[PDB]
Amino acid sequence: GIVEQCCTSICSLYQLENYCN
Amino acid sequence: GIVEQCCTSICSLYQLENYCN
Amino acid sequence: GIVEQCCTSICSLYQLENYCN
Amino acid sequence: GIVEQCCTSICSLYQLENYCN
Amino acid sequence: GIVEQCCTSICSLYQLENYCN
Amino acid sequence: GIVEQCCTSICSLYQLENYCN
Amino acid sequence: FVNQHLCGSHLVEALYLVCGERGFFYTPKT
Amino acid sequence: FVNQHLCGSHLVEALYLVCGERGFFYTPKT
Amino acid sequence: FVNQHLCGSHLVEALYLVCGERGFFYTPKT
Amino acid sequence: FVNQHLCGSHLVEALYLVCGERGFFYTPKT
Amino acid sequence: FVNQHLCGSHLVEALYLVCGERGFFYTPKT
Amino acid sequence: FVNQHLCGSHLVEALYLVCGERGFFYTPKT
Ligand SMILES: [Zn+2]
Ligand SMILES: [Zn+2]
């Protein structure tokens, strides 16, 4: 998931925004 | 909520465990 | 400057982009 | 010691507590 | 102590060296 | 440059001071 | 011993420390 | 914005800054 | 949603997050 | 609580949160 | 130039930066 | 002072503490 993608690869702030409430 | 308990007041690391999944 | 805009007042992540090179 | 064990392996908060004054 | 010197007052990085082992 | 040297190798605080305004 | 205030990003850092692999929710409006 | 490489507590810091008062869920794989 | 204050090292951490590879300047006297 | 993988300044942050007003000693191997 | 206040976890982060391998003690009750 | 191994946001934190009110430029290679 996102925690793993950001750490093993890269991720964008727009992808992170999907985890906001 | 958590801000009232831990920031405005003080809380322990044990009380933080209340917000784990 | 940045301290007046973002610390003393509040600013968004979009406004922070103003200080990128 | 603890600094090395936490970084090369894993450590618990209870093991860290031994370094408190 | 360190909190009085560096937090309540201000201190330099040189004064922090006083608390190294 | 400095960002890379500090991360791939090591750097001193005196070398960092050159990036201060 | 008495505890201290944990605010802003320091609060979420503490939740990360305590919950780790379990995950957590940070819901300041609640 | 730029892409990010974020591990550990750095990821929760980023979520905190992106989400603000909305809050977030942190859900690592186990 | 409304934003929060970013001060001291938290401000520079946010600039790092937003600018990354582009670099940035932090000039508090300006 | 969960087990932790902590390097560098992250370890001192964890000691700060665990120990609170008690304080701590940080003693890396050399 | 004049210095700033270093409090809480930011103080211990600064001690880590300055002392590194030498180690340090953080004793707020002293 | 001691030598430092500093990656990512840790480098910007160090620049913040070294430079203080002077500010700094963060200029990674691209
Ligand atoms: Zn880190
Ligand atoms: Zn802070």
Side-chain angles (χ1 to χ4, degrees):
Chain A
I2 191 66
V3 176
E4 297 72 39
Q5 180 199 323
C6 291
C7 185
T8 70
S9 186
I10 55 176
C11 63
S12 70
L13 300 191
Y14 294 93
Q15 287 171 329
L16 291 182
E17 198 186 14
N18 291 319
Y19 295 84
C20 303
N21 296 316
Chain B
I2 192 176
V3 174
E4 291 70 45
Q5 300 287 306
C6 298
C7 173
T8 308
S9 191
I10 60 179
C11 74
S12 68
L13 295 177
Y14 293 95
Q15 286 169 268
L16 287 178
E17 288 203 301
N18 294 151
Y19 304 98
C20 306
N21 290 317
Chain C
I2 192 176
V3 174
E4 291 70 45
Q5 300 287 306
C6 298
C7 173
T8 308
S9 191
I10 60 179
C11 74
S12 68
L13 295 177
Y14 293 95
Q15 286 169 268
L16 287 178
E17 288 203 301
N18 294 151
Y19 304 98
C20 306
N21 290 317
Chain D
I2 191 66
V3 176
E4 297 72 39
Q5 180 199 323
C6 291
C7 185
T8 70
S9 186
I10 55 176
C11 63
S12 70
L13 300 191
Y14 294 93
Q15 287 171 329
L16 291 182
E17 198 186 14
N18 291 319
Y19 295 84
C20 303
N21 296 316
Chain E
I2 192 176
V3 174
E4 291 70 45
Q5 300 287 306
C6 298
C7 173
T8 308
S9 191
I10 60 179
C11 74
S12 68
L13 295 177
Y14 293 95
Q15 286 169 268
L16 287 178
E17 288 203 301
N18 294 151
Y19 304 98
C20 306
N21 290 317
Chain F
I2 191 66
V3 176
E4 297 72 39
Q5 180 199 323
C6 291
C7 185
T8 70
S9 186
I10 55 176
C11 63
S12 70
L13 300 191
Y14 294 93
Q15 287 171 329
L16 291 182
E17 198 186 14
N18 291 319
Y19 295 84
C20 303
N21 296 316
Chain G
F1 329 112
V2 301
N3 310 131
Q4 330 282 50
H5 304 262
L6 290 166
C7 297
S9 64
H10 304 291
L11 180 57
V12 301
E13 286 253 10
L15 283 170
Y16 170 82
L17 187 72
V18 169
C19 302
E21 66 197 68
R22 302 173 62 184
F24 67 80
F25 54 98
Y26 173 61
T27 48
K29 303 196 285 187
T30 296
Chain H
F1 302 123
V2 295
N3 294 315
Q4 313 289 151
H5 185 198
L6 296 162
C7 297
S9 62
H10 303 289
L11 187 278
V12 311
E13 287 264 20
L15 282 170
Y16 173 83
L17 287 162
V18 167
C19 300
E21 58 176 7
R22 303 170 69 170
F24 60 92
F25 271 65
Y26 174 68
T27 54
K29 195 178 149 36
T30 48
Chain I
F1 329 112
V2 301
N3 310 131
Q4 330 282 50
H5 304 262
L6 290 166
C7 297
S9 64
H10 304 291
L11 180 57
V12 301
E13 286 253 10
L15 283 170
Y16 170 82
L17 187 72
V18 169
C19 302
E21 66 197 68
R22 302 173 62 184
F24 67 80
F25 54 98
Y26 173 61
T27 48
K29 303 196 285 187
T30 296
Chain J
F1 302 123
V2 295
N3 294 315
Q4 313 289 151
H5 185 198
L6 296 162
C7 297
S9 62
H10 303 289
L11 187 278
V12 311
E13 287 264 20
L15 282 170
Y16 173 83
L17 287 162
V18 167
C19 300
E21 58 176 7
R22 303 170 69 170
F24 60 92
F25 271 65
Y26 174 68
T27 54
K29 195 178 149 36
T30 48
Chain K
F1 329 112
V2 301
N3 310 131
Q4 330 282 50
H5 304 262
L6 290 166
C7 297
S9 64
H10 304 291
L11 180 57
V12 301
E13 286 253 10
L15 283 170
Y16 170 82
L17 187 72
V18 169
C19 302
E21 66 197 68
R22 302 173 62 184
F24 67 80
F25 54 98
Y26 173 61
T27 48
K29 303 196 285 187
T30 296
Chain L
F1 302 123
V2 295
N3 294 315
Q4 313 289 151
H5 185 198
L6 296 162
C7 297
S9 62
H10 303 289
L11 187 278
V12 311
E13 287 264 20
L15 282 170
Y16 173 83
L17 287 162
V18 167
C19 300
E21 58 176 7
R22 303 170 69 170
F24 60 92
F25 271 65
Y26 174 68
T27 54
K29 195 178 149 36
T30 48

PDB file of all heavy atoms in Angstrom, chain G residues 2-27:
ATOM      1  N   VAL G   2       5.844  13.151  35.949  1.00  0.00           N
ATOM      2  CA  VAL G   2       4.707  13.741  35.228  1.00  0.00           C
ATOM      3  C   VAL G   2       5.003  13.946  33.740  1.00  0.00           C
ATOM      4  O   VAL G   2       6.149  14.183  33.343  1.00  0.00           O
ATOM      5  CB  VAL G   2       4.184  15.054  35.875  1.00  0.00           C
ATOM      6  CG1 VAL G   2       3.729  14.809  37.311  1.00  0.00           C
ATOM      7  CG2 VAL G   2       5.224  16.167  35.814  1.00  0.00           C
ATOM      8  N   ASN G   3       3.956  13.850  32.928  1.00  0.00           N
ATOM      9  CA  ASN G   3       4.073  13.914  31.460  1.00  0.00           C
ATOM     10  C   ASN G   3       4.086  15.346  30.927  1.00  0.00           C
ATOM     11  O   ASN G   3       3.928  16.298  31.712  1.00  0.00           O
ATOM     12  CB  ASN G   3       2.959  13.077  30.821  1.00  0.00           C
ATOM     13  CG  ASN G   3       2.875  11.676  31.414  1.00  0.00           C
ATOM     14  OD1 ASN G   3       1.791  11.212  31.788  1.00  0.00           O
ATOM     15  ND2 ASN G   3       4.028  11.002  31.527  1.00  0.00           N
ATOM     16  N   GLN G   4       4.290  15.491  29.607  1.00  0.00           N
ATOM     17  CA  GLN G   4       4.349  16.798  28.931  1.00  0.00           C
ATOM     18  C   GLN G   4       3.335  16.862  27.797  1.00  0.00           C
ATOM     19  O   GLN G   4       2.687  15.866  27.468  1.00  0.00           O
ATOM     20  CB  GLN G   4       5.740  17.081  28.354  1.00  0.00           C
ATOM     21  CG  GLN G   4       6.894  16.452  29.117  1.00  0.00           C
ATOM     22  CD  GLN G   4       7.263  17.201  30.386  1.00  0.00           C
ATOM     23  OE1 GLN G   4       6.403  17.520  31.219  1.00  0.00           O
ATOM     24  NE2 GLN G   4       8.556  17.480  30.543  1.00  0.00           N
ATOM     25  N   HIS G   5       3.217  18.042  27.205  1.00  0.00           N
ATOM     26  CA  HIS G   5       2.297  18.262  26.122  1.00  0.00           C
ATOM     27  C   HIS G   5       2.924  17.773  24.826  1.00  0.00           C
ATOM     28  O   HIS G   5       4.123  17.984  24.557  1.00  0.00           O
ATOM     29  CB  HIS G   5       1.939  19.756  26.040  1.00  0.00           C
ATOM     30  CG  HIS G   5       1.380  20.298  27.316  1.00  0.00           C
ATOM     31  ND1 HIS G   5       0.026  20.442  27.527  1.00  0.00           N
ATOM     32  CD2 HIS G   5       1.990  20.716  28.456  1.00  0.00           C
ATOM     33  CE1 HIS G   5      -0.173  20.929  28.742  1.00  0.00           C
ATOM     34  NE2 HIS G   5       1.003  21.112  29.321  1.00  0.00           N
ATOM     35  N   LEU G   6       2.089  17.129  24.032  1.00  0.00           N
ATOM     36  CA  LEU G   6       2.465  16.645  22.697  1.00  0.00           C
ATOM     37  C   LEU G   6       1.518  17.267  21.703  1.00  0.00           C
ATOM     38  O   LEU G   6       0.309  16.996  21.723  1.00  0.00           O
ATOM     39  CB  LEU G   6       2.336  15.127  22.617  1.00  0.00           C
ATOM     40  CG  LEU G   6       3.339  14.277  23.391  1.00  0.00           C
ATOM     41  CD1 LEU G   6       2.844  12.833  23.456  1.00  0.00           C
ATOM     42  CD2 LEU G   6       4.701  14.382  22.705  1.00  0.00           C
ATOM     43  N   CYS G   7       2.059  18.119  20.862  1.00  0.00           N
ATOM     44  CA  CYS G   7       1.236  18.918  19.942  1.00  0.00           C
ATOM     45  C   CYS G   7       1.748  18.812  18.523  1.00  0.00           C
ATOM     46  O   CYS G   7       2.921  18.539  18.297  1.00  0.00           O
ATOM     47  CB  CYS G   7       1.250  20.379  20.347  1.00  0.00           C
ATOM     48  SG  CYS G   7       0.530  20.646  21.981  1.00  0.00           S
ATOM     49  N   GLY G   8       0.838  19.007  17.574  1.00  0.00           N
ATOM     50  CA  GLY G   8       1.204  19.030  16.166  1.00  0.00           C
ATOM     51  C   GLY G   8       1.928  17.808  15.709  1.00  0.00           C
ATOM     52  O   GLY G   8       1.534  16.670  16.004  1.00  0.00           O
ATOM     53  N   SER G   9       2.991  18.038  14.957  1.00  0.00           N
ATOM     54  CA  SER G   9       3.672  16.909  14.367  1.00  0.00           C
ATOM     55  C   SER G   9       4.293  16.041  15.468  1.00  0.00           C
ATOM     56  O   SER G   9       4.465  14.865  15.258  1.00  0.00           O
ATOM     57  CB  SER G   9       4.688  17.378  13.343  1.00  0.00           C
ATOM     58  OG  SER G   9       5.671  18.114  13.969  1.00  0.00           O
ATOM     59  N   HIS G  10       4.616  16.593  16.650  1.00  0.00           N
ATOM     60  CA  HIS G  10       5.208  15.789  17.706  1.00  0.00           C
ATOM     61  C   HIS G  10       4.206  14.726  18.210  1.00  0.00           C
ATOM     62  O   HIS G  10       4.575  13.636  18.581  1.00  0.00           O
ATOM     63  CB  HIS G  10       5.671  16.685  18.869  1.00  0.00           C
ATOM     64  CG  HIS G  10       6.629  17.774  18.464  1.00  0.00           C
ATOM     65  ND1 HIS G  10       7.926  17.538  18.041  1.00  0.00           N
ATOM     66  CD2 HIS G  10       6.438  19.108  18.354  1.00  0.00           C
ATOM     67  CE1 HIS G  10       8.500  18.690  17.708  1.00  0.00           C
ATOM     68  NE2 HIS G  10       7.628  19.672  17.904  1.00  0.00           N
ATOM     69  N   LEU G  11       2.935  15.086  18.230  1.00  0.00           N
ATOM     70  CA  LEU G  11       1.871  14.138  18.598  1.00  0.00           C
ATOM     71  C   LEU G  11       1.838  12.982  17.609  1.00  0.00           C
ATOM     72  O   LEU G  11       1.750  11.816  18.024  1.00  0.00           O
ATOM     73  CB  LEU G  11       0.496  14.826  18.739  1.00  0.00           C
ATOM     74  CG  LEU G  11      -0.715  13.964  19.115  1.00  0.00           C
ATOM     75  CD1 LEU G  11      -0.450  13.247  20.423  1.00  0.00           C
ATOM     76  CD2 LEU G  11      -1.912  14.903  19.228  1.00  0.00           C
ATOM     77  N   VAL G  12       1.861  13.265  16.308  1.00  0.00           N
ATOM     78  CA  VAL G  12       1.791  12.155  15.361  1.00  0.00           C
ATOM     79  C   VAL G  12       3.056  11.303  15.384  1.00  0.00           C
ATOM     80  O   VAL G  12       2.994  10.101  15.160  1.00  0.00           O
ATOM     81  CB  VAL G  12       1.396  12.576  13.921  1.00  0.00           C
ATOM     82  CG1 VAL G  12       0.041  13.269  13.911  1.00  0.00           C
ATOM     83  CG2 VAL G  12       2.412  13.476  13.282  1.00  0.00           C
ATOM     84  N   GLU G  13       4.191  11.931  15.668  1.00  0.00           N
ATOM     85  CA  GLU G  13       5.438  11.179  15.810  1.00  0.00           C
ATOM     86  C   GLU G  13       5.291  10.208  16.998  1.00  0.00           C
ATOM     87  O   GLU G  13       5.708   9.032  16.918  1.00  0.00           O
ATOM     88  CB  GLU G  13       6.628  12.130  15.987  1.00  0.00           C
ATOM     89  CG  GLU G  13       6.999  12.803  14.686  1.00  0.00           C
ATOM     90  CD  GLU G  13       8.280  12.261  14.094  1.00  0.00           C
ATOM     91  OE1 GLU G  13       8.803  11.227  14.582  1.00  0.00           O
ATOM     92  OE2 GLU G  13       8.765  12.877  13.139  1.00  0.00           O
ATOM     93  N   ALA G  14       4.687  10.672  18.093  1.00  0.00           N
ATOM     94  CA  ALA G  14       4.507   9.802  19.250  1.00  0.00           C
ATOM     95  C   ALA G  14       3.558   8.641  18.954  1.00  0.00           C
ATOM     96  O   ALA G  14       3.810   7.512  19.371  1.00  0.00           O
ATOM     97  CB  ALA G  14       4.063  10.599  20.474  1.00  0.00           C
ATOM     98  N   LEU G  15       2.486   8.922  18.209  1.00  0.00           N
ATOM     99  CA  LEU G  15       1.554   7.848  17.778  1.00  0.00           C
ATOM    100  C   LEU G  15       2.276   6.834  16.919  1.00  0.00           C
ATOM    101  O   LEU G  15       2.036   5.630  17.050  1.00  0.00           O
ATOM    102  CB  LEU G  15       0.378   8.420  16.969  1.00  0.00           C
ATOM    103  CG  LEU G  15      -0.701   9.089  17.811  1.00  0.00           C
ATOM    104  CD1 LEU G  15      -1.683   9.835  16.931  1.00  0.00           C
ATOM    105  CD2 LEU G  15      -1.419   8.029  18.643  1.00  0.00           C
ATOM    106  N   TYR G  16       3.161   7.304  16.022  1.00  0.00           N
ATOM    107  CA  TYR G  16       3.945   6.388  15.210  1.00  0.00           C
ATOM    108  C   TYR G  16       4.797   5.499  16.142  1.00  0.00           C
ATOM    109  O   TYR G  16       4.844   4.270  15.971  1.00  0.00           O
ATOM    110  CB  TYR G  16       4.821   7.145  14.212  1.00  0.00           C
ATOM    111  CG  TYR G  16       5.823   6.274  13.498  1.00  0.00           C
ATOM    112  CD1 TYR G  16       5.451   5.515  12.395  1.00  0.00           C
ATOM    113  CD2 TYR G  16       7.142   6.213  13.934  1.00  0.00           C
ATOM    114  CE1 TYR G  16       6.360   4.712  11.756  1.00  0.00           C
ATOM    115  CE2 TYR G  16       8.062   5.396  13.320  1.00  0.00           C
ATOM    116  CZ  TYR G  16       7.679   4.662  12.210  1.00  0.00           C
ATOM    117  OH  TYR G  16       8.607   3.870  11.563  1.00  0.00           O
ATOM    118  N   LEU G  17       5.459   6.117  17.128  1.00  0.00           N
ATOM    119  CA  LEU G  17       6.313   5.359  18.037  1.00  0.00           C
ATOM    120  C   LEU G  17       5.512   4.268  18.795  1.00  0.00           C
ATOM    121  O   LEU G  17       5.925   3.109  18.896  1.00  0.00           O
ATOM    122  CB  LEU G  17       7.008   6.270  19.060  1.00  0.00           C
ATOM    123  CG  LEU G  17       8.054   5.551  19.923  1.00  0.00           C
ATOM    124  CD1 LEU G  17       9.267   5.230  19.071  1.00  0.00           C
ATOM    125  CD2 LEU G  17       8.457   6.400  21.118  1.00  0.00           C
ATOM    126  N   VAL G  18       4.342   4.651  19.300  1.00  0.00           N
ATOM    127  CA  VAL G  18       3.559   3.765  20.146  1.00  0.00           C
ATOM    128  C   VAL G  18       2.825   2.698  19.336  1.00  0.00           C
ATOM    129  O   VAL G  18       2.725   1.569  19.782  1.00  0.00           O
ATOM    130  CB  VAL G  18       2.604   4.599  21.034  1.00  0.00           C
ATOM    131  CG1 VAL G  18       1.589   3.718  21.715  1.00  0.00           C
ATOM    132  CG2 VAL G  18       3.418   5.367  22.058  1.00  0.00           C
ATOM    133  N   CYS G  19       2.268   3.060  18.190  1.00  0.00           N
ATOM    134  CA  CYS G  19       1.441   2.123  17.418  1.00  0.00           C
ATOM    135  C   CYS G  19       2.205   1.320  16.358  1.00  0.00           C
ATOM    136  O   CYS G  19       1.877   0.148  16.120  1.00  0.00           O
ATOM    137  CB  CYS G  19       0.288   2.871  16.736  1.00  0.00           C
ATOM    138  SG  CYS G  19      -0.792   3.755  17.865  1.00  0.00           S
ATOM    139  N   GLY G  20       3.193   1.958  15.729  1.00  0.00           N
ATOM    140  CA  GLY G  20       3.998   1.313  14.693  1.00  0.00           C
ATOM    141  C   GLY G  20       3.148   0.546  13.707  1.00  0.00           C
ATOM    142  O   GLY G  20       2.199   1.108  13.117  1.00  0.00           O
ATOM    143  N   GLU G  21       3.504  -0.733  13.539  1.00  0.00           N
ATOM    144  CA  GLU G  21       2.860  -1.674  12.612  1.00  0.00           C
ATOM    145  C   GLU G  21       1.351  -1.787  12.739  1.00  0.00           C
ATOM    146  O   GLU G  21       0.674  -2.189  11.775  1.00  0.00           O
ATOM    147  CB  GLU G  21       3.492  -3.080  12.760  1.00  0.00           C
ATOM    148  CG  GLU G  21       3.229  -3.722  14.123  1.00  0.00           C
ATOM    149  CD  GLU G  21       4.152  -4.881  14.444  1.00  0.00           C
ATOM    150  OE1 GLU G  21       5.357  -4.641  14.647  1.00  0.00           O
ATOM    151  OE2 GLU G  21       3.668  -6.034  14.500  1.00  0.00           O
ATOM    152  N   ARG G  22       0.811  -1.453  13.912  1.00  0.00           N
ATOM    153  CA  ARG G  22      -0.637  -1.557  14.116  1.00  0.00           C
ATOM    154  C   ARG G  22      -1.396  -0.489  13.313  1.00  0.00           C
ATOM    155  O   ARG G  22      -2.593  -0.637  13.018  1.00  0.00           O
ATOM    156  CB  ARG G  22      -0.973  -1.407  15.598  1.00  0.00           C
ATOM    157  CG  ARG G  22      -0.304  -2.416  16.524  1.00  0.00           C
ATOM    158  CD  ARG G  22      -0.599  -2.042  17.972  1.00  0.00           C
ATOM    159  NE  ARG G  22      -2.035  -2.110  18.213  1.00  0.00           N
ATOM    160  CZ  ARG G  22      -2.639  -1.780  19.354  1.00  0.00           C
ATOM    161  NH1 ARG G  22      -1.915  -1.354  20.397  1.00  0.00           N
ATOM    162  NH2 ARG G  22      -3.970  -1.896  19.459  1.00  0.00           N
ATOM    163  N   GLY G  23      -0.693   0.587  12.962  1.00  0.00           N
ATOM    164  CA  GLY G  23      -1.328   1.778  12.396  1.00  0.00           C
ATOM    165  C   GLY G  23      -2.076   2.569  13.448  1.00  0.00           C
ATOM    166  O   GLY G  23      -2.175   2.166  14.601  1.00  0.00           O
ATOM    167  N   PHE G  24      -2.611   3.708  13.029  1.00  0.00           N
ATOM    168  CA  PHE G  24      -3.287   4.593  13.938  1.00  0.00           C
ATOM    169  C   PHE G  24      -4.136   5.557  13.161  1.00  0.00           C
ATOM    170  O   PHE G  24      -4.001   5.663  11.953  1.00  0.00           O
ATOM    171  CB  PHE G  24      -2.295   5.337  14.882  1.00  0.00           C
ATOM    172  CG  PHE G  24      -1.373   6.318  14.196  1.00  0.00           C
ATOM    173  CD1 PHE G  24      -1.812   7.593  13.840  1.00  0.00           C
ATOM    174  CD2 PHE G  24      -0.054   5.961  13.895  1.00  0.00           C
ATOM    175  CE1 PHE G  24      -0.950   8.494  13.226  1.00  0.00           C
ATOM    176  CE2 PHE G  24       0.797   6.867  13.249  1.00  0.00           C
ATOM    177  CZ  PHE G  24       0.356   8.132  12.932  1.00  0.00           C
ATOM    178  N   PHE G  25      -5.038   6.227  13.857  1.00  0.00           N
ATOM    179  CA  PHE G  25      -5.769   7.308  13.247  1.00  0.00           C
ATOM    180  C   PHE G  25      -5.498   8.579  14.043  1.00  0.00           C
ATOM    181  O   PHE G  25      -5.385   8.549  15.284  1.00  0.00           O
ATOM    182  CB  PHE G  25      -7.277   7.003  13.188  1.00  0.00           C
ATOM    183  CG  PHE G  25      -7.890   6.633  14.521  1.00  0.00           C
ATOM    184  CD1 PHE G  25      -8.565   7.594  15.273  1.00  0.00           C
ATOM    185  CD2 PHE G  25      -7.802   5.331  15.036  1.00  0.00           C
ATOM    186  CE1 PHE G  25      -9.116   7.275  16.507  1.00  0.00           C
ATOM    187  CE2 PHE G  25      -8.357   5.016  16.279  1.00  0.00           C
ATOM    188  CZ  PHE G  25      -9.020   5.992  17.003  1.00  0.00           C
ATOM    189  N   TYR G  26      -5.372   9.678  13.311  1.00  0.00           N
ATOM    190  CA  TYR G  26      -5.176  10.988  13.890  1.00  0.00           C
ATOM    191  C   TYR G  26      -6.344  11.811  13.409  1.00  0.00           C
ATOM    192  O   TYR G  26      -6.419  12.127  12.239  1.00  0.00           O
ATOM    193  CB  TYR G  26      -3.849  11.595  13.395  1.00  0.00           C
ATOM    194  CG  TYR G  26      -3.657  13.035  13.821  1.00  0.00           C
ATOM    195  CD1 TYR G  26      -3.606  13.377  15.172  1.00  0.00           C
ATOM    196  CD2 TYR G  26      -3.554  14.070  12.869  1.00  0.00           C
ATOM    197  CE1 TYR G  26      -3.437  14.706  15.571  1.00  0.00           C
ATOM    198  CE2 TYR G  26      -3.396  15.391  13.262  1.00  0.00           C
ATOM    199  CZ  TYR G  26      -3.340  15.700  14.620  1.00  0.00           C
ATOM    200  OH  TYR G  26      -3.172  16.985  15.057  1.00  0.00           O
ATOM    201  N   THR G  27      -7.268  12.120  14.313  1.00  0.00           N
ATOM    202  CA  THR G  27      -8.529  12.770  13.955  1.00  0.00           C
ATOM    203  C   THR G  27      -8.733  13.949  14.908  1.00  0.00           C
ATOM    204  O   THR G  27      -9.471  13.826  15.888  1.00  0.00           O
ATOM    205  CB  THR G  27      -9.695  11.755  14.019  1.00  0.00           C
ATOM    206  OG1 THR G  27      -9.642  11.012  15.251  1.00  0.00           O
ATOM    207  CG2 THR G  27      -9.552  10.759  12.872  1.00  0.00           C
TER     208      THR G  27
END
